[PDB]
Design a binder for these strands. Structure first.
Ligand SMILES: OC[C@H]1O[C@@](CO)(O[C@H]2O[C@H](CO)[C@@H](O)[C@H](O)[C@H]2O)[C@@H](O)[C@@H]1O
Ligand SMILES: OC[C@H]1O[C@@](CO)(O[C@H]2O[C@H](CO)[C@@H](O)[C@H](O)[C@H]2O)[C@@H](O)[C@@H]1O
Ligand SMILES: [Mg+2]
Length: 580
DNA sequence: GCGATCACGTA
DNA sequence: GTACGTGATCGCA
């Protein structure tokens, strides 16, 4: 049942039609400066397989690749685009990306290869990449006959599937979402990943030595307090010391033993001095292993830059994820960890890091979607939302709001966005269900619009089978009808949260597209480096800071128009840490 | 070599 | 109670 195709030894005119399914295969998971093992082109004239050495050296082919008028349909065009950027070749004219199309149609499918997307439309004349390349150690590029066959079948699948996918996207009112949001963003993410972020490796290594020193001290202190040595990083060995040798109370159990999570340890601190030391060890050890050593392992030795890969088709809510390294979870909450950011520096001398972040975008989005009068007014007055919530749920004036009252109102606001639950709020604020329930009840009394939204959105998820975001992203919630309380409740929380987190994702994605257009129009050298859900990190000549101070916030604030204003704070400095 | 567990970093 | 990714340990191949 082999598929017919030409194993070309040279590029020909018919291979450069103005519309084609293109496969520029990069097998290495991390495509940065990675090899392109083969190329397949399927168009009106037939199916072709070209060896990369040949194709990429052919002037006509490279010109075809960069010609925006020559339209290409692909799967994960960003992967190809970045791999090509590393070879100094521009990819343009990608009008359809099956990966992104599949992702928008149903994020839950976990589509990560052409075969998975094709299976959505009962097309199975293509093999899963894992079947062809294997995984782990067994992973390898098969001989040309097998490789060529696979790439051609993928291009053929893309060629056949474009119409049906676009048709369904259109029915879902997601056609613009793909064409005007995700696909253009893909090119922006490609530029960001390729540009990378410069790392001050000397600073990291210095912090590592200081940490190693402190860690040794705390480590020895722990052995001294426990009366023996053991693997502190072993929750099993640690559990024996804590709950057996030291007789500390067992307040929380895990699935396979005693729990030793930070939340549990905090409660045990009053009983033994060893606890605070374990907590300190946990903090320093996390920085050392994950942010000092982990980061140093992925820094390109030549450029000293880290090139993350933003997975644009993974999260169930529309957010991006970041890997190798993850640049969306660099420490900031605790000062010791926050200093890690001093290692992220501008890529050129006399340039600076500029960071802009939305202030409470999720709650502003909630105010908009729920049309809660009280909540919308609060933002229209740009009030401290946590103090305002405390004032309302505890019924007091601003001056009567104590720090603990704001702390709890803050916790309530988080729960509301995540899918409020008396049990959940209880565990978080360490109080009884009855108490937590009363807080939630008080919240809804003050924000009836939000209560109505939470009730209505769950009902809608059940009626339609899914929930949507501001820009029409969708997430199916089949569990919304489960007769199992736990399974159903999780789906209900997703119904409440997805439109919020998802709409916030839509907004910043459009902001990125709008920003890049503005930067180009102004011919600024400034460029995006990272996106961390509700913030954009750029770098630019120190001479562009004043213009960026006005331009970036405005573009982000004007990405979409809501019933409440969007507010963006911004800072800049010599390092990411200093952009505060 | 792999993957389940537990842990913890972010918004 | 939302959404993620990475690393140390550990027991089975
Ligand atoms: O290229 C990113 C794109 O590829 C997928 C598979 O189609 O993920 C692959 O590449 C990621 C980046 O290296 C890895 O984290 C992942 O494990 C690997 O399968 C998509 O999920 C993603 O959108
Ligand atoms: O008591 C109604 C109240 O319960 C929630 C869960 O907190 O939903 C339950 O009741 C609905 C009927 O009104 C069902 O459709 C739903 O499946 C069930 O879990 C809230 O959404 C609702 O306001
Ligand atoms: Mg913020």
């Amino acid at each position: 049942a082999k598929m017919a195709f030409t194993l070309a030894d040279r590029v020909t005119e018919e291979m450069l039609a103005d519309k084609a399914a293109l496969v520029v295969e990069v097998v290495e998971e991390n495509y940065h400066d990675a090899p392109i093992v083969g190329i397949a082109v399927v168009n009106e004239h037939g199916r072709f397989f070209l060896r990369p050495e040949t194709a990429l050296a052919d002037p006509q082919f490279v010109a075809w690749l960069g010609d925006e008028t020559k339209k290409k349909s692909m799967f994960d065009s960003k992967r190809a685009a970045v791999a090509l950027k590393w070879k100094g070749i521009e990819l343009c004219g990608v009008s359809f990306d099956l990966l992104l199309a599949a992702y928008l149609l149903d994020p839950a499918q976990g589509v990560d290869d052409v075969a998975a997307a094709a299976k959505m439309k009962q097309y199975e004349a293509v093999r899963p990449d894992e079947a062809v390349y294997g995984k782990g150690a067994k992973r390898a590029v098969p001989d040309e006959p097998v490789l060529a066959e696979h790439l051609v079948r993928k291009a053929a699948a893309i060629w056949e599937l474009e119409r049906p996918f676009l048709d369904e996207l259109r029915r879902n009112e997601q056609d613009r979402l793909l064409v005007e949001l995700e696909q253009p963003l893909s090119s922006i993410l490609a530029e960001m990943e390729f540009a990378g972020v410069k790392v001050d490796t000397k600073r990291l290594e210095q912090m590592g030595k200081e940490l190693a020193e402190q860690l040794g001290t705390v480590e020895q202190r722990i052995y001294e307090l426990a009366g023996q040595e053991f693997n502190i990083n072993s929750p099993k060995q640690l559990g024996v010391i804590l709950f057996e040798k030291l007789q500390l109370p067992v307040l929380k159990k895990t699935k396979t033993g005693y729990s030793t999570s930070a939340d549990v340890l905090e409660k045990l601190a009053p009983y033994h001095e060893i606890v605070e030391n374990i907590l300190h060890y946990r903090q320093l050890g996390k920085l050392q292993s994950t942010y000092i050593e982990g980061l140093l392992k992925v820094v390109r030795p030549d450029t000293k830059k880290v090139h993350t890969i933003f997975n644009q088709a993974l999260t169930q809510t529309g957010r991006l994820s970041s890997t190798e390294p993850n640049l969306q979870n660099i420490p900031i909450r605790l000062e010791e960890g926050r200093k890690i950011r001093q290692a992220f520096v501008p890529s050129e001398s006399d340039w600076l890091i500029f960071a802009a972040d939305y202030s409470q975008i999720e709650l502003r989005v909630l105010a908009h979607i729920a049309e809660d009068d009280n909540l919308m007014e609060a933002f229209r007055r740009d009030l401290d939302i946590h103090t305002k919530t405390a004032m309302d749920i505890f019924q007091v004036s601003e001056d009567e709001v104590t720090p603990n009252m704001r702390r709890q109102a803050k916790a309530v606001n988080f729960g509301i966005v995540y899918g409020i639950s008396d049990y959940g709020l209880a565990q978080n604020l360490n109080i009884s269900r009855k108490e937590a329930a009363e807080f939630i009840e008080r919240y809804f009394e003050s924000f009836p619009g939000v209560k109505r939204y939470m009730e209505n959105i769950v009902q809608e998820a059940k009626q339609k089978g899914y929930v949507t975001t501001l820009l029409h992203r969708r997430r199916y919630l089949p569990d919304i009808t489960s007769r199992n309380f736990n399974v159903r409740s999780f789906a209900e929380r997703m119904a409440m949260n997805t439109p919020i987190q998802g709409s916030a994702a839509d907004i910043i994605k459009k902001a990125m597209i709008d920003l890049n257009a503005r930067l180009k129009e102004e011919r600024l050298q400034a460029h995006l480096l990272l996106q961390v859900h509700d913030e954009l990190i750029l770098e630019a000549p120190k001479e562009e800071m004043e213009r960026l101070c006005r331009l970036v916030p405005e573009v982000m604030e004007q990405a979409v128009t809501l019933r409440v204003p969007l507010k963006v704070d911004y800072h800049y400095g010599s390092t990411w840490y200093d952009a505060k």
